[PDB]
């Protein structure tokens, strides 16, 4: 595609920055509801009916299936 | 003033003068063509003399329209409706300008 000739996609400039911010905001909004004494737990069905009820952020982010690298960064954080 | 594109001139248009220094312009909504008097008009005759009279009457109607236009003193004739080859040649013979199917705007 074009003169660069690389077999893959390419995002440059404000687009990739916005994508990274969107991924980080998605990860944050996943666990935002489980903060503070007035927080609430979450259910995590594991695709075969296994249920995990938790409020811990690390458990939620570890059990989730994430694909965006900028979001995997926050999960590993 | 006003300017617009040339609109499908018929035969004999190139014989008309293309510049006038004080023309009177005839703005018309008239179809100057040899055609039926009306779409629901039928002519019934039983004599060859009446047949010739009817043909001459159609020609005389067209020529009366053309002569009424010509005697008005106008040199440029514009119509919202088609102007036939007969009318174009008639106006060419009188050193006049004609243009049919001029858009309404």
């Amino acid at each position: 595609e074009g003169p660069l000739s690389v077999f893959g996609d390419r995002s440059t400039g404000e687009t990739i920055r916005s994508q990274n911010v969107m991924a980080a905001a998605s990860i944050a909004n996943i666990v935002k509801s489980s903060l503070g004494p007035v927080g609430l737990d979450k259910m995590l069905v594991d695709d075969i009916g296994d249920v995990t009820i938790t409020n811990d952020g690390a458990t939620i982010l570890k059990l989730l299936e994430v694909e965006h690298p900028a979001a995997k960064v926050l999960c590993e954080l | 003033g006003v300017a617009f594109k040339k609109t499908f001139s018929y035969a004999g248009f190139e014989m008309q003068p293309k510049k006038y220094h004080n023309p009177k312009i005839a703005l018309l909504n008239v179809e100057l063509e040899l055609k039926a008097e009306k779409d629901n008009a039928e002519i019934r005759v039983h004599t060859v003399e009446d047949y010739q009279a009817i043909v001459d009457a159609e020609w005389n109607i067209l020529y009366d329209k053309l002569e009424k236009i010509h005697h008005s003193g106008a040199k440029v004739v514009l119509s919202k409706l088609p102007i036939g080859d007969v009318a174009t040649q008639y106006f060419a013979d009188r050193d006049m300008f004609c243009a049919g199917r001029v858009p309404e705007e």
């Binding site: 074009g2 003169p3 000739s5 | 047949y51």
Partner: protein, 525 residues
């Protein structure tokens, strides 16, 4: 960077583009393919091709004509299309030389390919070829000989030209008979050039030597029911009237009556009008009446009652040929009998040809229109006889129009090549090489003529080049034995117009093809 070799794709799907070397490669390949295909059908010992169509009817066509070979094939190479159109235009201009011009263009383009391989800019080649064309045209014009003043010498020239034209075709088996046939048919035109005045009738069966030129004229129509089938001292009237329930041309006319008796009266009036028209025709004092249009039953019966032959549905060509052969006037009104010329012939009769019956006009008055009956063993044989005879008639008509003639058998090509070579030995630069290639192709033409016969083409062409070098300007290929000889003595003659047209058209097509450095194709529909 080019359009195709760019990172961005700039074309629609299915559309491509060929740059300099690729375009030259494709053009040269197509031109050489066309030249190699059309050749081997050249000269007295050329062979014919079979054109088997791929359509539903699968038309089968045996032919030796280059134009018919080139037009009836599926051509996709644009340069090949250019050569095909050249051949078609050459056939339209004159009846002969299609194979010659196509082969000459192909050889010129082959030499152009060699020169391009030798790192020569094509504009230099084009300029050299323009100079060579000027020199060759001047030499050919200077070599022309005219015999139009003397009638016997012109007759001999016509015989020689017809024989040379028919030498390469299937009619070479009876060349003498067919040469006399074509020469007489052309001479009967009295100077008129309309070949459509000569009708070729192909009847299956019989030998090819059974073909003949009728002393009068032959019509493929039929006579009425109660009319005579044989008339002596005919006074023919040729017409183009209705004679089919002749309606008054007032479109809006209609019959509006209040009783069937009035309808019967109007019908009787119509029949009486037709009878009056027939009587007005009969007032001309005629024996045979030929109408272009149909003749219905009532006029046919009226003619039969008067003993008048009534040939109907003789098409535009039919009435024109009858007027030419008999001198009558094609009329459409019969109010002035004194102002209408009537055709005349000694005898009208029905003759039995094959299993079909034709009307025979004998002892015609003018005779400036010919009919030629062709007999053959197969449909393909008849088709090739017609095509070859058409070529001969076209060349003879051109010679009648312009009587200048040149010598064939390669003599003309070799003399033009000699002039071009002498010019080349006088010019500095690569244009000399271009002119040398031009002369090489001009000499390659008789080389192919000699190859088609299995002769030693190299030796014969070298001998011809030498002989033209010492000044023997009439030397050429003697194809009877395989030596060189005097075409003036051997009577191998050609029309100057045909050779000039061949040379100029070949040079023109080579120049236009060589100028192309890029071929761009839109997406096929």
């Amino acid at each position: 960077a080019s359009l195709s070799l760019a990172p961005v794709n700039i074309f629609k799907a299915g559309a491509d583009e060929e740059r300099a070397e690729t375009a030259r490669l494709t053009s040269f390949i197509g031109a050489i393919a066309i030249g190699d295909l059309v050749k081997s059908t050249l000269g007295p010992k050329g062979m014919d091709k079979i054109l088997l169509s791929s359509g539903r009817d699968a038309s089968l066509m045996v032919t030796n004509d280059g134009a018919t070979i080139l037009k009836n094939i599926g051509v996709d190479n644009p340069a090949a299309k250019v050569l095909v159109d050249m051949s078609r235009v050459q056939d339209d201009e004159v009846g002969d030389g299609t194979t010659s011009v196509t082969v000459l263009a192909a050889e010129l383009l082959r030499e152009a390919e060699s020169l391009i391989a030798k790192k020569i800019h094509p504009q230099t080649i084009i300029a050299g070829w323009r100079e060579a064309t000027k020199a060759a045209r001047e030499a050919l014009l200077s070599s022309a000989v005219d015999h139009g003043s003397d009638e016997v010498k012109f007759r001999q020239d016509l015989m020689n030209i017809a024989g040379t034209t028919l030498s390469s075709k299937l009619l070479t088996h009876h060349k003498d008979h067919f040469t006399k046939l074509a020469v007489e048919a052309v001479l009967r035109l009295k100077g008129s050039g309309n070949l459509e005045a000569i009708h070729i009738i192909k009847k299956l069966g019989g030998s090819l030597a059974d073909s003949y030129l009728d002393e009068g004229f032959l019509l493929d129509k039929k006579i009425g029911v109660n009319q005579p089938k044989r008339i002596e001292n005919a006074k023919i009237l040729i017409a183009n009237t209705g004679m089919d329930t002749d309606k008054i041309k007032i479109f809006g006319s209609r019959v509006r009556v209040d009783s069937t008796a009035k309808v019967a009266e109007i019908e009787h009036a119509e029949k009486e009008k037709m009878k009056e028209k027939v009587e007005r025709i009969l007032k001309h004092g005629i024996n045979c009446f030929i109408n272009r249009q149909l003749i219905y039953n009532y006029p046919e019966q009226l003619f039969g009652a008067a003993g008048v032959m009534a040939i109907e549905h003789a098409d535009f060509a039919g009435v024109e040929r009858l007027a030419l052969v008999t001198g009558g006037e094609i009329a459409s009104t019969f109010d002035h009998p004194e102002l209408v010329k009537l055709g005349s012939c000694k005898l009208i009769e029905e003759v039995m040809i094959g299993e079909d019956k034709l009307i025979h006009f004998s002892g015609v008055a003018l005779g400036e229109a010919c009919t030629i009956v062709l007999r053959g063993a197969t449909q393909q044989i008849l088709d090739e006889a017609e095509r070859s005879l058409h070529d001969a008639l076209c060349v003879l008509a051109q010679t009648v129009k312009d009587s200048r003639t040149v010598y064939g058998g390669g003599c003309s090509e070799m003399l033009m090549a000699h002039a071009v070579t002498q010019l080349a030995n006088r010019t500095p630069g690569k244009e000399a090489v271009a002119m040398e290639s031009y002369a090489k192709a001009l000499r390659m033409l008789p080389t192919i003529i000699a190859d088609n016969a299995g002769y030693d083409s190299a030796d014969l062409v070298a001998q011809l080049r030498a002989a033209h070098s010492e000044g023997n300007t009439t030397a050429g290929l003697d194809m009877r034995e395989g030596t060189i000889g005097d075409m003036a003595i051997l009577g191998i003659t050609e029309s100057f117009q045909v050779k000039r047209q061949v040379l100029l058209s070949a040079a023109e097509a080579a120049e236009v093809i060589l100028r192309v450095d890029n071929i761009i194709k839109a997406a096929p529909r």
